[PDB]
């Protein structure tokens, strides 16, 4: 699915991102933006092997099993596949437990090179929430 972006802004508020770990609405909605341009389906490979899944671009290193990384630690216990849903709740499950894990938002490349000090709260300008 690829979601418009007050649609997107409206699923992740309702399953709890909204300040999650201190990070407004605004950084997750960016996150996405930049890191899948807003599909769910979006895939990219990785020159160490690993890809990337999803809304949220999760690494198949650390957080999901594809079944083809290896030596991967599958953290969030989840397929690779269930982050290609057009249901968000896996992605906002396991992005619960990334940005909980130490460097907050600035595991998600994209988040930390084009969101990271912007004024985020435009990307959920406009909307009903
Ligand atoms: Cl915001
Ligand atoms: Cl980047
Ligand atoms: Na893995």
Redesign the pocket.
Known sequence: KVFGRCELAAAMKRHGLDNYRGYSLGNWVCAAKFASNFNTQATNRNTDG?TDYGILQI????????GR?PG????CNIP?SALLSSDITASVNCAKKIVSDGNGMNAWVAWRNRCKGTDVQAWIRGCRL
């Open positions: 690993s690494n198949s290193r650390w957080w999901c099993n594809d990384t991967s630690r599958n953290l690779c």
